[PDB]
Nucleic acid binder design. Structure first.
Ligand SMILES: [K+]
Ligand SMILES: [Mg+2]
Ligand SMILES: [Mg+2]
Ligand SMILES: [Mg+2]
Ligand SMILES: [Mg+2]
Ligand SMILES: [Mg+2]
Ligand SMILES: [Mg+2]
Ligand SMILES: [Mg+2]
Ligand SMILES: [Mg+2]
Ligand SMILES: [Mg+2]
Ligand SMILES: [Mg+2]
Ligand SMILES: [Mg+2]
Ligand SMILES: [Mg+2]
Ligand SMILES: [Mg+2]
Ligand SMILES: [Mg+2]
Ligand SMILES: [Mg+2]
Ligand SMILES: [Mg+2]
Ligand SMILES: [Mg+2]
Ligand SMILES: [Mg+2]
Lengths: 88, 73, 101, 119
RNA sequence: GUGGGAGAGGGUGGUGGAAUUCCCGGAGUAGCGGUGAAAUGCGCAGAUACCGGGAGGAACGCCGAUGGCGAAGGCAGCCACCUGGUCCACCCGUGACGCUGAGGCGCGAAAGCGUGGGGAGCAAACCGGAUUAGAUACCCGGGUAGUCCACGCCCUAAACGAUGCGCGCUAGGUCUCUGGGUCUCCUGGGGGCCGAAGCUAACGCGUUAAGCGCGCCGCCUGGGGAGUACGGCCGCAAGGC
């Protein structure tokens, strides 16, 4: 799973300023982390539907926060996308 | 229906999580192998629920009895 | 890595040469799967509940270890290869939980 | 012709019949009986009385083989399982202990439609 | 975000004992079995009952609950690994990012279809034995698909709380699962029960609303004809919408 310093290392990478654990950026990153992990676990275990549900959900949350971000600051959105290597 | 006292009431401060300790766990079984109910074991919902799993572990390890035979019937 | 407890129930009818053999094999397997040992308890011959492999006794060992969880299962498998090893229960260790405290 | 004198008596009690087996201390049988052994034919083989006569027949035959004191094992639940132990205590064999071994699965097999609402 | 937690939530690999069947071996003999009573059936080629050994399949006693988890279907031996949801405390961060949701897409008991496996017990169909006026049926003995596994279809249901989702408000009492606490008690979140107000045709519901409101979706408009016909779409078919 994601251990503690893994998650942290992701936050201290995506934080908009020291101490920000909450910004939309850090959320999309953290989500994106959990999502990629999940779909990797779902490459095998094609039969595990219950985790897939969670995935559908995680993903929806991500797309939701993105549509917020791009509604708000296109600059930072675009940057956040380019930095995450997502959508497409 | 299982009326005397509370297996726990007479016992020390004891790990409910130790599968390796028989002599405590033995007291939570019946005349038959059967894991004792709450009426007898007198535990907490969560306590009982632990004692269960630690017993069955103990069993598989070959320490506690899986089943037994009733005497004087 | 994570912290486990390996349980070995062995064949009591071993003398020293063969007990040495099984110990060597086990600890060499723990070394090979990357399990750093911490505490080990040898409880030796104990009278079982029900007979395991026709035998009323069993040879008990308890190894607290730490290892690469992704490999734990395989370690178990190797440990079971020997005829003389009658039971292997590896449980993931956890802290004590109490009553009448 | 073995002259045993210390033994086991397994009373096995069904609903449709009763039967006793008297065996050596190691589990090897010596003699036996059942509701059909003594007279009975139909349902009658599962009476208490049938159980009595059965048990007693076995014990008699045991004392013919030379048997004196036996431990009882009781498998099953049927009318005059208890009566079987009764005729065994009134047998003239010294009964060392009664023990109930009646087997039950830990939810193993599907039962017949008659036995359902179990598994 | 941090730090705690409970859990038959899911997927994968392993492993445990009880029981049944079957085979091998010891001993043992005249029945066992089954029913309302019976018979078919099995049994001198030695059955049942008893001991020891082997093999294999399937389910998981006690714990077990009025319990728990899950969106629903549904989930129960134990172990490890992969993973989902969720609760609480701290009041740390973002700053309305929210709710509902026709289409779509995904899941979806059981039975059923396809292709390979597997098959112990049970078992539609079926073969018999009985019972009755007759017996097809119920009761008894056999037994095939199936029940199990993998991959792919099928999409139904009393898929039920017969009660759409979200939020806010409106007495309490008692029982309980699980967190926090100044731990008889208080506070949060689940599961039940009784009852204010209120509602209801009644029965009943009543902070787990069927009360008082607002948002959004689905649906209803006498009964039979009918979930029929025709048309379309899906489906290997069965058949579904
Ligand atoms: K049509
Ligand atoms: Mg589970
Ligand atoms: Mg014949
Ligand atoms: Mg076979
Ligand atoms: Mg029960
Ligand atoms: Mg979890
Ligand atoms: Mg704040
Ligand atoms: Mg601000
Ligand atoms: Mg289905
Ligand atoms: Mg099916
Ligand atoms: Mg098929
Ligand atoms: Mg049958
Ligand atoms: Mg039948
Ligand atoms: Mg409540
Ligand atoms: Mg409450
Ligand atoms: Mg009420
Ligand atoms: Mg009123
Ligand atoms: Mg009309
Ligand atoms: Mg229809």
């Amino acid at each position: 799973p994601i251990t503690k310093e893994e998650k942290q290392k992701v936050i201290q990478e995506f934080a908009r300023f020291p101490g920000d654990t909450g910004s939309t950026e850090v959320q999309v990153a953290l989500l994106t982390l959990r999502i990629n992990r999940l779909s990797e676990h779902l490459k095998v275990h094609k039969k595990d539907h219950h985790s897939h549900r969670g995935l559908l959900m995680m993903v929806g949350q991500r797309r939701r926060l993105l549509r917020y971000l791009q509604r708000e600051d296109p600059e930072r959105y675009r940057a956040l996308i380019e930095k995450l290597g997502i959508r497409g | 229906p299982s009326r005397k006292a509370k297996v726990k009431a007479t016992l020390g401060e004891f790990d409910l999580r130790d599968y390796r300790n028989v002599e405590v766990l033995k007291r939570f079984l019946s005349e038959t192998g059967k894991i004792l109910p709450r009426r007898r074991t007198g535990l907490s919902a969560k306590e009982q629920r632990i004692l269960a799993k630690t017993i069955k572990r103990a069993r598989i390890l070959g320490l506690l009895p899986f089943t037994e035979k009733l005497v004087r019937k | 890595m994570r912290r486990y407890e390996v349980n070995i129930v062995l064949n009591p009818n071993l003398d020293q040469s063969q007990l040495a053999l099984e110990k060597e094999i086990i600890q060499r397997a723990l070394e090979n799967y990357g399990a750093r040992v911490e505490k080990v308890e040898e409880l030796g011959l104990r009278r079982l509940a029900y007979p395991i492999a026709k035998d009323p006794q069993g040879y008990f060992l308890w190894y607290q270890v730490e290892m690469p969880e992704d490999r734990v299962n395989d370690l178990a498998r190797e440990l079971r290869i020997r005829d003389n090893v009658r039971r292997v229960m590896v449980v993931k260790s956890q802290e004590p939980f109490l009553a009448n405290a | 012709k073995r002259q045993v004198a210390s033994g086991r008596a397994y009373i096995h009690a069904s609903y449709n019949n009763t039967i006793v087996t008297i065996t050596d201390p190691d589990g090897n049988p010596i003699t036996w009986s059942s509701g059909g052994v003594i007279g009975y034919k139909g349902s009658r083989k599962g009476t208490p009385y049938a159980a009595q006569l059965a048990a007693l027949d076995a014990a008699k035959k045991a004392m013919a083989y030379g048997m004196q004191s036996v431990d009882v094992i009781v498998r099953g639940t049927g009318a005059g399982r208890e009566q079987a132990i009764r005729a065994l205590q009134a047998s003239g064999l010294q009964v060392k202990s009664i023990v109930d071994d009646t087997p039950v699965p830990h939810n193993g097999c599907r039962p017949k439609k008659k036995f359902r609402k179990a598994s």
